[PDB]
Ligand binder design. Structure first.
Ligand SMILES: Nc1ncnc2c1ncn2[C@@H]1O[C@H](COP(=O)(O)OP(=O)(O)O)[C@@H](O)[C@H]1O
Ligand code: BEF
Lengths: 95, 50, 49, 102, 88, 50, 97, 102
């Protein structure tokens, strides 16, 4: 029993991608364009729309996170977005 | 309000007339639909489909 | 319920012959197996991720 | 066995091999008492011909052959519509699959 | 918590006795009422700071430049009729 | 077969995976730092401009 | 061949959307984008799905307003195809940034 | 009640408490503290009537949020009053350019 070696000692216990990429797609932008009333479009719009998201979403995101930090809430609620929308000049009803 | 309620009254009148017109459409469809398959006719259609 | 085995139809029915084949373990796959199994037994039996 | 065996399987290609007729009359008895059955026989012993013959008997003895449903796994989806294509073809079969358009 | 669903419900009922409501629309109306109230009330506060001092004239004037005049005259007239009804 | 197994597991196969994941985490952290510093530079330039 | 001239179905399909009012952006990629743009600040954010729905509605509304405005700006000129010039002009005119 | 004696129906006291908590002034005007509620009641009556009309137009008994959307958007005065604010699950009036048509 004592002499020799073998695996019968269970173990001691050791330890044993977060980059993320932007989404959206061309058909979604095409549907949004068709909602806006455009007959024909060129092939250079999608990059610019993606730029509009990359310039619009992140700013309100920063304002929202600094607001909820100013509220001393370690979580984000839908009501926090409404403050950002109000100070951005485009308010949303329903939340 | 008055203009749009007159529009709504016209819409309700159209609703009623289309109700009655599709009621008579359904009546005509029932008359022209197949009736009383019975035995020999149902087996005739069955053997043709066979 | 309604069940009928192959006993109902047996006049012309070839039988079933069960056979078990034993296969050895290759050297590098044996290395892989030992590494994975020791790592798993060290992780699961105690603290882990 | 409280089962009355009297089939009229018209327009049915082939014939039950003296083993599916008992299943047919068992299913007829089950229908006659307004109950639900379980045809849990050994796999491969012609469940499809049993149910096809049951439906054919229901369509021949009774004047009711309304829209019935065959819920099946995907792989056999064609086989069923062929199962009584080779067998009793007096029924009108529909196959439901293949994208929203068709 | 005191919701405002009852008041808007009875106003809809006295202006439309057979028209229903949707849950999303209930929040829509609640937010509309709340933010209009706050907007006009801070307008009244800034109008009180307008005069070199510490009523109803301030609120009447505040509603008199915040919303289009056509509905503004009706608003002030019906408010005055309400206060006359409440006076005695 | 104990000794050669112990030696090869001292070399190990999952060790290469851990090394690869460490390199991945390292370059991901470097990319995140570059992103953060570029965003900070853009923000300070924008604040200076206005 | 049931092929219609370019734009024949476009007007119909525009009518179909401008009748509709549903979500035009798939929720999962929008979640991916939100997480990607939000993880650059702090971990354990614990977003509530109602919040992401709110910003989704906000961004689609802003984009449709933008796109109708650039459609007007393009129909100004003898043009029915949209190019970066109209988008840049619409962005600069209102002084967004 | 105070609203009943005034002919109003909105709860005046709740708004009084809200304004007292908001401390927009030390001594709020108590000559007609429900007057600011009266103007809001008038505006709410307008918007509710328009929404009910819009819902009645498309044969739907209940107030669709889209129905309210076109109710507010159709009125030019309402658009001037509230035009910088959007509505969740709203919509856009169908606006197709005449010169765009083939
Ligand atoms: N009475 C019969 N005549 C001819 N073939 C039969 C008969 N009964 C069963 N079979 C054959 O047995 C096979 C059984 O397949 P099927 O009935 O489709 O499903 P399962 O294998 O579950 O019974 C079929 O391919 C069919 O050709
Ligand atoms: F093979 Be069986 F009859 F399912």
């Amino acid at each position: 029993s004592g002499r020799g070696k073998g695996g019968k000692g269970l173990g001691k216990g050791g330890a044993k991608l977060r980059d993320n990429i932007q989404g959206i797609t061309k058909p979604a932008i095409r549907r949004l364009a068709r909602r806006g009333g455009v007959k024909r479009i060129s092939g250079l719009i999608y990059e610019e729309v993606r730029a509009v998201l990359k310039s619009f979403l992140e700013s309100v995101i920063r304002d929202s996170v600094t607001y909820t930090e100013h509220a001393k809430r370690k979580t984000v609620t839908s009501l926090d977005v409404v403050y950002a929308l109000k100070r951005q000049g485009r308010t949303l009803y329903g939340f | 309000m008055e203009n749009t309620m007159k529009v709504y009254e016209k819409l309700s009148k159209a609703e009623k007339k289309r109700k009655i017109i599709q009621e008579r459409i359904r009546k005509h469809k029932e008359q022209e639909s197949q009736h009383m398959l019975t035995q020999e006719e149902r087996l005739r259609i069955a053997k043709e489909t066979e | 319920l309604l069940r009928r085995l192959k006993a109902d139809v047996e006049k012309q029915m070839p039988a079933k012959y069960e056979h078990i084949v034993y296969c050895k373990l290759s050297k590098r796959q044996r290395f892989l197996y030992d590494d994975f199994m020791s790592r798993a037994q060290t992780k699961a039996t105690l603290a882990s991720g | 066995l409280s089962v009355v065996d009297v089939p009229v399987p018209s327009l049915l290609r082939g014939n039950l091999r003296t083993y599916q007729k008992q299943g047919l009359n068992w299913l007829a008895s089950l229908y006659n008492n307004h109950t639900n059955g379980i045809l849990a026989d050994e796999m491969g012993l012609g469940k499809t011909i049993q149910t096809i013959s049951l439906l054919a008997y229901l369509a021949c003895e009774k004047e009711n052959w309304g829209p019935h449903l065959i819920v099946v796994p995907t792989s056999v989806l064609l086989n069923w519509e062929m199962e009584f294509k080779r067998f009793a073809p007096g029924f009108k079969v529909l196959t439901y699959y293949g994208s929203p358009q068709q | 918590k005191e919701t405002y669903s009852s008041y808007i419900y009875k106003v809809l009922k006295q202006t439309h006795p057979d028209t229903g409501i949707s849950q999303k629309s209930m929040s829509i109306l609640n937010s509309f009422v709340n933010d209009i109230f706050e907007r006009i009330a801070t307008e009244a506060s800034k109008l009180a700071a307008y005069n070199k001092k510490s009523s109803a004239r301030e609120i009447q004037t505040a509603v008199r430049l915040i919303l289009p005049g056509e509905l503004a005259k009706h608003a002030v007239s019906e408010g005055t009729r309400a206060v006359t009804k409440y006076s005695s | 077969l104990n000794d050669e197994l112990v030696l090869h597991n001292k070399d190990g196969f999952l060790a290469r995976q851990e090394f690869l994941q460490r390199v991945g985490s390292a370059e991901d952290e470097r990319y995140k730092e570059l992103r953060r510093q570029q965003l900070a530079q853009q923000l300070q330039q924008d604040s200076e401009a206005s | 061949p049931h092929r219609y001239k370019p734009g024949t179905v476009a007007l119909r399909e525009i009518r179909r959307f401008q009748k509709s009012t549903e979500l035009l952006i798939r929720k999962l990629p929008f979640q991916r984008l939100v997480r990607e743009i939000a993880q650059d600040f702090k971990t354990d954010l614990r977003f509530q799905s109602s919040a992401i729905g709110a910003l989704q509605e906000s961004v689609e509304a802003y984009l449709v307003s933008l796109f109708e405005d650039t459609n007007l700006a393009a129909i100004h000129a003898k043009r029915v195809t949209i190019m970066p010039k109209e988008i840049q002009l619409a962005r600069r005119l209102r002084g967004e940034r | 009640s105070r609203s009943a004696k005034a002919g109003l129906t909105f709860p005046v006291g709740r708004v009084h408490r809200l304004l007292r908590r908001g401390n927009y002034a030390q001594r709020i005007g108590s000559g007609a503290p429900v007057y600011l509620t009266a103007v809001l009641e008038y505006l709410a009556a307008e918007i509710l009537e328009l929404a009910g009309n819009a819902a009645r137009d498309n044969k739907k008994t209940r107030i669709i949020p889209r129905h309210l959307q076109l109710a507010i958007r159709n009125d030019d005065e309402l658009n001037k009053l509230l035009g910088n604010v959007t509505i969740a699950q709203g919509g856009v009036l169908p606006n197709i350019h005449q010169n765009l048509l083939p």
